[PDB]
Symmetry: D4
């Protein structure tokens, strides 16, 4: 049973290869400052595409990285930016699956969000997000 | 931050509109038979796209419909076909999120599975799947 | 083994047709504005009757629409109205299943709530509840 | 927002009154035999309406009686009857929420199922179901 | 294989008969004021012993009454009074299973708590705890 | 609000001291053979009272031992015996929280079950139940 | 398949013998004061290694202890210290698994955290952490 | 406060670097046959260390791979081997977290298991496990 074409629509995604590349770059940037993090890349659909649990990363950081990446891709903004939204709209954080805490950054294709990169377990979420941005940076270019 | 094109890939979906069309057709065919079903359309990725709870449908049927659709699109075959696999490999049913019980059917686009339609709560699963096929049949075309 | 009249009671609900009709128009009103949302219709009992996942809706928005619709019908108010109740009873949002965030609006039958319509994923929850109202408006009159 | 009448619909329930005294009857008929059970009454929609945890009942039996009652009303048959269906359709038991094991019995209103009574934690499920019938027997008559 | 005596210990509970009597009176206190609640009795150990779901009670109120009764018995105080603890200790509410919101009240036996009574879904939590207190008030005497 | 006398009832338990001694003996028994297990003592109510995760125990064994203990206490029988009930009543294992697998063994107080001892992750469940019985063997006495 | 040696890394843990010793000590440091607590010891990886439910401990306290111990080891600080971090970072508490509430205290080996000890159920969380420190105090020395 | 060294023990693990290498090798093996799989590496403790979701892999496969990795490392044997155990001990598959289905294969250091590699979503689990073995094979050497 085949659908075509007016009932079809398309979406754009990172390849696994790209997601892995970005994720490993986020680890590597954290490694470079003697930091131990977990990293997640979450699709815009968002299934998780990649997780990496770093050596000596805190046990909480795994799921925390996942949810940051989810939150970033959901609204196409850094979670550090998104946490500022809770001043006016404090129940945004009651939306299931979210974590409004610095360390997730969106990846876009022609403007539109396709993935989030989440990092957790550094001394602060601001440093987390710096490593997440380092992850995004190796794409494409 | 912007990936291009060697680290991007495309995937194909039903529109909400087509998913709703095929869903509501499946209800229609069930109601033609004086039966009360729940119907789910589930993406290949598979997020649920559409649920409809029939009037007077059993309370079990809602989730049952979803997992039938999920199972159909996961392996690109009717759940009645897939249920037959359990004789040789009984532990396939222990894969999370699956239900190996007639009433789920795949939709394809260009050969690849793009959605599953799942029906539950007719007096038996062979009837469920009959209405599932009827929903699929209103695509494309 | 059959029960008789005094120990039976009745309740009132949208038909599936009604709930589908309302949800689809809420999507229709969103896509008019270039907006990509998920819509849920949840019963007073509240099982979910309908979900629709709009093309290009954020992945968080599906569950979010659901809980809004649940929260609206639970208290027979807009969730935007209900969110302001948190100022002096802050632990209302600790009630399981609830999301106190604009985008849910109740549907009534002689004054008593029978359904909720939740929308999520527009630029603001205020816009969500506008499209939620536009869904409720096609009922029916 | 007010719906009128050709997209409203009606459904019939046991009153809480009626469900409570059916549940307490099932307990009392268990305690006739020095037997210590849990009882649940689940609606057709099926929310649970009543639970009672017997003095000295096994810790497993609370949730067990819930699921038996859900299962019985879902298919409008006693769970002892339903259990025997698994010879032909073994994956019926993979439907979420269900327990295909004697101790649940349906209550009807003009013919159509409106509640299930579930009992758990007697020496046998067959004895569970006898107490469950002794629950339903104080209706309506 | 049998423990005795000196590493056995005892604990004290409401009977099911007691707890049902308390639950139904809490309903019937709410019923007199035309209002539509769910009621739970939770043991000190705390398994739930009784739930009753009121006719036309909000779908939220079932779970919510449960957790109120859990919270009351956990600390041997009315939940309205436990909610005031949150000013100086805001993360008491992050303790799993708890709901810090008026409608739960302890029953004691010589001075130590043996069950909680939780009412939810009347127009204020402060009405809920009145009905919970009415539930406890039929014990003794 | 205090209840007296005859709407109270008692129940007998292991003390923590007892439950700990039993559990640590079970570990001791396993480690004597160079076996690495997890051990749980679950009450009759059954809350878990003690868990111990052995040095080098398989990651699965922790929850397994919990459920074996739960199952043994629930029906006042060794889970190895309980597993033989499945031939004639195969859906007993569909009862939530149970694990019908050798390694759980009941503790009694004048004849009535008060705790279960659960051991997992010896090379066989039969060996598990050996260590479970050895843990119970240091009780009372 | 054997990995060696540069794909391999080591980590340090409390033994079960040590973990039980520190947990038991926390218990009877609370029992010296006639207070009734749950104690949990969670590895840095963090699996739970030990739980003890104290005689007459509140039902909330079991899981409360677990998450305190988890929180403490995750950031290698007392949870009384950690809770103060919420003033300028309110959403730290939205990290899954965590409880930011006094009663959890880290154990280190060569400066690096290897376990957390969690106590819940005293009159206050500060008294919990006192007993938790008394647990940790029987190491190493 | 510092534990030392009698209270302390070591465990061996794959580095993240090693786990990623193996996971990517399993994918690359599958992609050579035109097969779209998910891969997971799970520690013996068993946290998941690495997940990769392959392009066009079935949605079920992600968690399936996770549980296969978990199951393999739990008993230090291929899951295809472990599935054969269910003939004699059929309730082994009722152990939480497990999937007794070909596609998981253990990795050892000095003969003791340190990780599992799980692959799901090829034409058969036997082929899954071939790709899993090819993942393991690039370690060490
Ligand atoms: Fe974190
Ligand atoms: Fe069904
Ligand atoms: Fe949303
Ligand atoms: Fe049972
Ligand atoms: Fe409520
Ligand atoms: Fe095991
Ligand atoms: Fe606590
Ligand atoms: Fe699979």
């Amino acid at each position: 049973v085949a659908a075509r074409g007016g009932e079809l629509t398309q979406s754009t995604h990172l390849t696994l290869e790209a997601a892995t590349k970005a994720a490993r770059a986020a680890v590597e940037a954290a490694e470079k400052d003697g930091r131990h993090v977990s990293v997640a890349v979450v699709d815009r659909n968002g299934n998780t595409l990649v997780t990496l649990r770093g050596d000596g990363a805190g046990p909480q950081s795994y799921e925390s990285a996942e949810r940051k990446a989810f939150t970033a891709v959901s609204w196409n903004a850094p979670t550090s930016e998104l946490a500022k939204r809770l001043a006016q709209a404090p129940t945004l954080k009651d939306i299931p699956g979210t974590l409004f805490l610095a360390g997730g950054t969106p990846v876009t294709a022609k403007g539109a969000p396709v993935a989030g990169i989440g990092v957790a377990g550094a001394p602060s979420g601001d440093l987390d997000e710096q490593y997440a941005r380092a992850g995004a940076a190796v794409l494409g270019h």
